[PDB]
Structure formats: C-alpha cells, structure tokens
Amino acid sequence: PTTDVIAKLDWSIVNEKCEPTIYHLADCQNWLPLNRWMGKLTFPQGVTSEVR
Amino acid sequence: LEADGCPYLYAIIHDSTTGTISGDFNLGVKLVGIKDFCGIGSNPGIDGSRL
Amino acid sequence: MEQNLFALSLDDTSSVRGSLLDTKFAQTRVLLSKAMAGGDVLLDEYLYDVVNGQDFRATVAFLRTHVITGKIKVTATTNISDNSGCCLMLAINSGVRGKYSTDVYTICSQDSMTWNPGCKKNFSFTFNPNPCGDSWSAEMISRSRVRMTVICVSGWTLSPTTDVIAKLDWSIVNEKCEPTIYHLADCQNWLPLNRWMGKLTFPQGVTSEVRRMPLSIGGGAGATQAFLANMPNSWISMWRYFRGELHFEVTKMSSPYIKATVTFLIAFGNLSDAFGFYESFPHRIVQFAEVEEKCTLVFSQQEFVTAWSTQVNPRTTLEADGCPYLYAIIHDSTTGTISGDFNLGVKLVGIKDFCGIGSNPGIDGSRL
Amino acid sequence: MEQNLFALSLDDTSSVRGSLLDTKFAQTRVLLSKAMAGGDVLLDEYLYDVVNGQDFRATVAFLRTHVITGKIKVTATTNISDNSGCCLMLAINSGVRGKYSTDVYTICSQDSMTWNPGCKKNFSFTFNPNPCGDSWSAEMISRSRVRMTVICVSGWTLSPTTDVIAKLDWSIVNEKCEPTIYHLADCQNWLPLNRWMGKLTFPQGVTSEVRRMPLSIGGGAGATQAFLANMPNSWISMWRYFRGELHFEVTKMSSPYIKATVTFLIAFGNLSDAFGFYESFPHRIVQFAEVEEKCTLVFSQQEFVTAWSTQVNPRTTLEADGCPYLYAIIHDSTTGTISGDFNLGVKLVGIKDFCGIGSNPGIDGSRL
C-alpha cells in the first residue's frame, strides 16, 4: 500500500457455551482436530511445471 | 523421495501462475483435522522432522 | 480352473463412459505469448495428434473403441487478472486444404468456444467431431484429418508480466451426438451459422463511434484481391433473398477496465455518423458487468419488412444500398484508467424461422 | 460455458471394474524351452514389473487407483498336443529374501495354480495380493515386493518340435478380496496349507512301485544339510500333535499317453514293498482320463484313531515310526507307447476340522 495500515480488533464476549477441546489416547476417535500447518506453497510467476 | 512409502499431498499448478502485477502465488495449506481417526501402535519416536 | 475363452466378455463394444476422471483422454498445453497480436495461431494441430504421448485413464479406451456415441468435452482452465483480458477462440473443423486461412471468420463456423480469460475462470464446451452422424471414432478423426485450432482474436489489453499457459482437458461425456446438417428447404426452423459478423474496435475518447455490419452476409468476408469462406455462409448464399429472427451473440474482448455502453439496432446504410438520433429507432443497450462477457441480441420479424438480399454488389455505396445493417453505436464514450481499445465481437449464431427465397446466380466479391 | 471445477467428479475413488476387456492390465510372455527340466524357473519377476511397458485398457486405471477391492485374475492360454504334457505352476508370494529357493515345495503355499497343458487348454485363477485385508493397490505391491514365479515342476514327457510360449493375461475381476489369516486357535474349521506332499515318479514297467509320503508334515522339506520352509507348514509345526480330515489334490504331470492306475491309502511305515495286500486297507483308486488332470482324495476322521505328531526325529526308521503315511501304490503297471515316467503330484490342500494339540518345542530336520 501507499501508507501504513491498521487492523482494529474488537474483543467481545458472546453467549455460546464454552466447549472443551481435550486430546486423549483412544485409538479410534471420531474427530481428532489438529490445525497443523502443512506449509506455505510459493509458486513463482511463469510457465514451468511447479509441483509441491 | 524414491524410497518413502507414506503418501504425500501433491499441489500442482494446473496451468500457470499469471497476473498483471509481479508477485508469487502463495497458498497456505492447513490440515484442520482427521475424521474417523484410527491410531495404531505405540511410537518409540524418531527425532527429526522432514522426509 | 479352466473356462471357455470364446464365451468371455472380450468383445465389449461399449462406448467410453464413467466419471470425468475416467473419460479424460488428453491434456494439451497452449502457450500464450506475453505480447500476442490479434489473428495469431497459438495452436494448430490435428485432433488425433492431441492424444500422442498421453497416459490418462481413457486414452487407450479412446483409441481402441471402434464406436463412440458420446461427445467430446473440452475445457480450458486459463485465467488472468481482471485488470487485463483478451479473447481466445478454440475451434474444430472437419478438415483442411494447403496454405489455409486462419482468420477468425473462416474458423468459427461449425464448432467453437469463444471466451475471455479476464472474466471467465474456465470455459467448457461439447461437440461432435462427425457432424453428419450419431457416432465417430479415433480412427475416423485421424484419417478424416479433423483439425483443432486455437486462435487469439484480440490481443492482451494489458500484457501480463510473464508468458501464460492454457490447459485444455479433452474428455468424453455421455451426451448423444446429434448431427448438424444443412439442406435446401426454403423454410427452416433453425439455420445455424456461427458467422463472424466482425470485430468492433472503438478507440478511447469522446467521438461519435458508429460501426455498421451489413446483414447481406453471403459471399464471404474480404482479404486482398480475395475472399474467405465458411461453409454455412456459402450455404446461405445459395438463396437470393432471405429473412428471419437473427440471433447475435456479442462478446467482450477487452478487459473489464475498459468500459463502454453499446446500442445495437437494425437500420439502413444512408444514416450518417454525427446523426444524433439513433435512439429513435428501436434498439438494445448493452452494458457489461466485470464478470459478464457474453450477451445475446435477438431481432424479431417486426424489425424487417421484407426479405433482403444475401449478397450485394461490392461497388454499391452506403447511400444506395437497400439491405439492412446492424449498427453498433457507442451510447456514451469509451473509458478506462488503462489505455487500450474497447473491443467487441459480434457473431451471428443463427437464424430462427429462416425463410430463403429464390436462387442466387451469385456475385463474386464480399463487402458492401 | 463455465462450470465450477471443484464440484466435478474428478475425485472418483471407484475400483477398477467392467468387462474382462476393460479390466485387463497386462499380458506376459513366458518362454518354455524345447528341453526344459523339473525345478526350472521360467519366469520370476515382481508382480508390479509385469505392468511395465503395457498399454491395455485398465493399465493406467490399475496404476493410479488408490484402492482396489477386486481380486486379480490371471489366465494362462498355453497348449500342447495330447501326446505330450508337463506341469507348470504359477505362484504368488508376498515377498523374498536374497538367494532364495525356487523349489516347488517353497513356492506353492499361499496362492497358486497348477496345470498340465496337455489336458487343460487354458487355466485361470483369482487371488488377493494382500493376504490380510480386503484391499490393495499397485503402489502397495510395488513397494511390498510381491513376487510372481512360474516354475516347471515336471519336464516335457515328449519334447515339442520347437519352443513354446505361455501367454498370461492379468485382469481385475470383481470378487471380494477375502483375507487368509493363520492363527493359534487349537480347533479350527479349515486350516489351508497348500503343502507339496511330493512329486511321485513311477518308472515304466512291471515292478511293485510303492511311494510313502509321511503325514508328519511339519518341519519343512529336505535339501543338502538344510531344509526349506513355507509359512503354513511352519505354522502347523507350532503344535505338537494334530488331526483332521485331510484334503489332498493329486495331479497328473506326465502326458495322457503314459497311463497308470494308482491306489491311495493311509497306513503305517512298517508295511514293506512286495507286501501284496494293500487293498485290504480302505483305499481310493485313481484312474485319469485323457482330459481329466486333477482329483481330490479326502480322508475322513475314521482313518485316524488319534492325533499324530507334526514333526518326527529324522533318524527314526520306517520300522519304528508310529505316525501314519499316505501310500501311493501302482494298482497295475505303468504303461505307454512312448517312453517317459508316470509323474504324479500330491498336494495337501488343507485340513478340515483341524485340531492342534500341545506346544511343539521343535525338532530341526525334515524327513522321517
């Protein structure tokens, strides 16, 4: 951009139930959340076979 | 990569990266979660990261 | 254990069928130069040479299946920033003869997609490579010399940073191959044409820009001391006079940034430029959004009193020419933040409720 | 026209399926020498290297389909005049270790077809290359090193004029892949083995030919100062004593021209050759027709009083060996117009109503 920018965050309290996310050692689980960053993929501008 | 029998997730450019302005086509992949997860065995561990 | 080998299902003459993955048979890589011009062959090869050096799921099924009742879908996944745009046209023609013309006019007839990468992310279209039957094969199109041609009808309005690629994905869908056969009935319900009425350039500025395209379409389009010919345009010139509901398909070829509003109307040649009352005539306004690229003008039977001639003598001036024209007039002005002309492509798709009168001896020439 | 490309059917994870034409994925060309011997590797390659340099309908589908729920059918279209005959055995094993044995004994376990070209025009058989699951893939079997082996267990009884070829046609049928898993339950309903009881040569002539094969099967088969091992034969030797209905599968390996009638019976080692009253025992006669090549002896629970030991000490003589044998006795005489022995291959397919007693410490050796 031409100048510096600002991001305004607005912290509130909504009225949803706080549900816990607890990991445990059961071998079969229905949903194991991870939020694992598989990676940032850069592809340069051009014509070549880009594979990641 | 020649002798590694676990699966990868490929991300392949189907055509070409384009634009009127210069800059790379960045793209962020994030494994959110595993559904119907099934974990087998008991890892002694390895010590390192990439494959 | 043993079995009788004669009675196995090895003489399976099924067509190719399944999902779009299992019917894909080739991918093709077209290179669009950073600085490409209009009337510029990007790709031009035989449709069977597409499949050379390929290893997709239906590649071997495609080559070896004796009959295929399905159409060929081709999809083109090319894109560019809204800032820019161009107009590509992929097009399939049943054959060739030496040293051929690759002007958009010549090609478009028969089976073609036209799209602007600037607006449309991808573009797909189905077609039948045997135009007079329900079926075809790989061996038919190799020996028949069916010819696929990609052409750039309008250059990049703003050039990209680097070269570009268009990936074509040739598949076989499961629609019935219906034939398109022209015949000499005087009254026909739908006479398709895909006649390139012409590319309309309007420069950026303030002036009264008016463009006439004559509806005496027959007898081809011009060249040097020469003229070009489609089949369907040569076919309509079989008759002397004709009429019908005309279905044009006007397309944007510039980028979304070059903006302009265009009135279309039927009217006669005598009307000058700097005649300021074009909206007295019945007309149709055409503004394009950023995303929209394609718009269909229809002109009913109430726009034409009588039939008009398919060909006219080349030396008739606009002053004494009693066939109708299709005017395309800039309603305001051609504008944009970036330099580049407002290109616009008109294509007579077909004539509905076609009525062909008489029997043309012929004229020999093109424009009026 | 445009379409949303994310929502197309390009993530089709279907198995390979269709007719036998559209599921064929490779053909293999085995050369059988004019003068080939018994115990002679004809082909021996990895099952994935079969598909290298191939271009059939399902070749690309086979390689790229992540999961395949169907079995692999292989059919072998080899033939020869009734005059001659041999015995080929194609066989699939889940892996290898350096400098391996290719004796028929070692191989047959797991998944195999055995046929005599002289009698059977062609021979087909299905199998699952992942023996402990419902599914597999091309990538599984390439990296797992699944190994296909064709072996000639008995040479040509009369040599052909020229060299021969066996064409194998590898397909994917649509049967469910059922797993074959061995486990340590003492009572089991069906314990498959595919244990090569041995090749029985009987020379042409008049003499009392008797061949004993011991049913103390465990602890492998012999070599030099060494012994060979299948898995299933090593598995049954986990137990000390065992019993059950034994299901043998006796096969002709010579030509139809060498004719002989064979009595099979259970009995103990003490019985000498030139003891002329073998048909006092309960027995089963086996004459083969020209076309028949395969016959299944079953020996019920009434043939055995108690269980018997899986292994016996190697130095026990026939005089003091209280486990049962399977005798194979020539009922008349081995005959034919052409010279050549009457070969005959016995293969313990499996034990029904298997009952395994105790816990074998082990013995170390093979034959009894």
Curated annotation (Swiss-Prot), chain B:
Posttranslational mods: Not glycosylated.
Name recorded for this polypeptide: Large capsid protein
Transmembrane domains' residue ranges: none
Highest taxon listed in the record's lineage: Viruses
Compartments, record wording: Virion
Region forming the signal peptide: none
Described function: Together with the mature small capsid protein, forms an icosahedral capsid (T=3) enclosing the viral positive strand RNA genome, with a diameter of approximately 300 Angstroms. The capsid is formed from 60 copies each of the large and the small capsid protein. The large capsid protein interacts with the viral RNA.
Subunit structure, as described in the record: Interacts with the mature small capsid protein. Homomultimer; assembles as pentons. Interacts with the movement protein (via C-terminus).
Entry domain remark: Contains a beta-sheet structure called beta-barrel jelly roll.
Source organism phylogeny: Viruses, Riboviria, Orthornavirae, Pisuviricota, Pisoniviricetes
Curated annotation (Swiss-Prot), chains C, D:
Site, as annotated: Interaction with the viral RNA: 17, 174, 190
Function: Together with the mature small capsid protein, forms an icosahedral capsid (T=3) enclosing the viral positive strand RNA genome, with a diameter of approximately 300 Angstroms. The capsid is formed from 60 copies each of the large and the small capsid protein. The large capsid protein interacts with the viral RNA.
Stretches of the chain forming a coiled coil according to its record: none
Modification comment: Not glycosylated.
Subcellular localization, as worded in the UniProt entry: Virion
Result, substituting residue 17 to D/E: Complete loss of RNA packaging and decreased capsid assembly
Record remark on domains: Contains a beta-sheet structure called beta-barrel jelly roll.
Protein name: Large capsid protein
Residue list for modification N-acetylmethionine: 1
Subunit structure: Interacts with the mature small capsid protein. Homomultimer; assembles as pentons. Interacts with the movement protein (via C-terminus).
